[model samples]
Target chain A: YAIYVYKVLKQVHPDTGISSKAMSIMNSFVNDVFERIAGEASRLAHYNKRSTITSREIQTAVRLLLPGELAKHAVSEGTKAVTKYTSAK
Target chain B: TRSSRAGLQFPVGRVHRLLRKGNYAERVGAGAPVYLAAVLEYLTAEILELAGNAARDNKKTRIIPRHLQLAVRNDEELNKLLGRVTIAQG
Candidate 1:
């Protein structure tokens, strides 16, 4: 949504460039990253027979299928960012 | 219309309290408090409607803090100038 592959290609290459397109391209990378995190965590909640995905499932999911080296570090840092921005009180 | 105006209650007490808080208790002299109050209420009503519309557009039911702040964020001059008035003697 925020990224249309055609639009990104148009900007990155400008005129006389971008000779091709893709089914998903970078958009999939972005979308999958989000769905991977949110869905995987939510699925963990369901698998544990819970209706709500809380910090328990999220931390577990991040530890499980989070991908790549520094994934744990990313999760830790992500937690920090989320806490700073999302504290309603 | 003149008689109907008597029934309306202005938020003067709260406005006066804020004015005092802003360190303009004695500096502003007279008439400024009511003038500022008049301005604030009118402006806030419009801005609330703007934010309310944005919330509805985003498919939200309640007016969250984002609705209030983003109403200004989406606009340029209003974000900067709205409620950002100079209160010096004129």
Candidate 2:
């Protein structure tokens, strides 16, 4: 996930290569984010009677994992793309 | 001799569903960026509390990932939430 973010940031900036400093900062941020997301998801799963975490659950957690602004932008675009694909089908 | 059970009482499939449901989809939908900021805030607070507790107890590890896992597992609210989901073992 951090890698994806790094790639996106790098592409937007072009010259940057996910500098050590930037990586460190993002790593700390991402780690905390992932942990909480996992914690919440795990709690939910327990409630739902599911034991192991699945990719689908992770997908949902990802939506709740990011900041609202970023999530909105990212999900909206992806949702549109998916809708387009489904429509094409 | 006394009798004891050491293995997981529940089926793996049942557990798998519980874990999967914990993921974010139910809250934010798919293909979303998952609000990292909010998650980070919660994590940071949790880490600090765990660290403080560990220090008070003279523990060796300070705010490690496992500690966070332990903390979540111990959460009553989480347990209640988890208890709601149903799964089959087969």
Candidate 3:
């Protein structure tokens, strides 16, 4: 999924000229962020405090997991998707 | 956690029903599409839960693809199904 995201981003942001190495770094960064977020959500879920996990928590977790410009974009996009889809029903 | 884990067992029953009906051929006919996906999903969840427990205990990592492969290899039902099929692994 990260690779797919990178390919799409590269096409649109050719001027950025992000190399494969950069993409690899970005992928690792994103994965680590996701892992931490999942871990936290799992922790909350484990406590039986919230039977339902909102996507906002996930997006926030992901945002906190990353740093810099990519983090901002991920947060903005993730939050938008989560808010739109989760509220659609 | 308990409820979600129990919910995962539903697919296992579905698989067992399909297997009992002798529909294995129907499952396999769709381009190497044996209905092991359910079993795989169950095993994957088991592995993930085990990993999650381990992580919670001491910050261990969750099950990776290799762990899943190992779990599948040791699955008696999966092995039995594989033996009955003419799957060629190259």
DockQ for every model, please: 0.01, 0.05, 0.02
What TM-score do all the candidates reach, one by one? 0.36, 0.36, 0.35
DockQ-sorted candidate list, best first: 2, 3, 1
How would you encode candidate 2's per-residue C-alpha lDDT over A1-89 as one tens digit per residue?
34544444433333333335534544554444455556655656667767544434444554555444434443443344334423442
Return the lDDT, model 3, position B48: 37
lDDT at residue B12 of model 2 (Cα atoms): 24
**How well does candidate 1 reproduce the true complex, by DockQ?**
0.01
Judged by lDDT, which candidate is best?
1
Q: Which ten residues in a row have the lowest lDDT in candidate 1 chain B?
A: B1-10
Q: Give lDDT tens digits, candidate 2, residues B1-90.
A: 000011111122322333335453344322112222222323333333443344335453223444434544565432232222211233
lDDT (Cα) of model 2? 0.39
The root-mean-square deviation over C-alpha atoms between each candidate and the true structure, in angstroms, is 25.2, 16.7, 19.5
On DockQ, the leading prediction is 2
